[PDB]
Amino acid sequence: KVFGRCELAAAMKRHGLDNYRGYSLGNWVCAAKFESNFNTQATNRNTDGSTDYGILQINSRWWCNDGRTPGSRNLCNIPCSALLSSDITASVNCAKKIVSDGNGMNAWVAWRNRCKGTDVQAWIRGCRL
Numbered sequence: 333k334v335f336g337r338c339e340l341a342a343a344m345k346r347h348g349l350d351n352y353r354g355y356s357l358g359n360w361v362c363a364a365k366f367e368s369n370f371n372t373q374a375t376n377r378n379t380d381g382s383t384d385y386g387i388l389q390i391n392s393r394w395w396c397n398d399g400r401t402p403g404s405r406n407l408c409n410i411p412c413s414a415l416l417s418s419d420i421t422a423s424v425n426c427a428k429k430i431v432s433d434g435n436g437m438n439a440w441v442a443w444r445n446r447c448k449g450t451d452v453q454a455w456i457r458g459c460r461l
């Protein structure tokens with residue numbers, strides 16, 4: 333599914349992300365834009381044998397089980413396929429764990445490169461939720 337911008341903001345809001353750990357809804361929407369272009373099916377295989385899954389490009393080295401990644405942990409207690417669903421529940425719950433793990437939203441490289449320190453409220457302009 334490719335979400336619309338405000339459609340995603342609304343779903344994220346319903347799932348309790350706005351101001352979760354102090355991160356505004358625009359930060360979350362911006363992260364999804366640059367991690368996956370709002371595509372729930374996005375995947376990326378890394379040279380290290382891990383894979384990033386879903387709308388928030390969550391990595392299998394630590395966060396989910398894909399059956400093929402080294403270490404390896406499953407800190408969100410999910411199969412990585414759950415991160416590829418059209419509904420964002422699993423991704424949101426896992427993101428809440430990640431953002432709480434000691435690096436904040438800096439765990440998302442595309443958020444660091446395109447969102448951090450920017451006027452991220454722009455990502456919810458016109459949504460009026």
Ligand code: NA
Binds near residue numbers: 445
């Ligand atoms: Na860059």
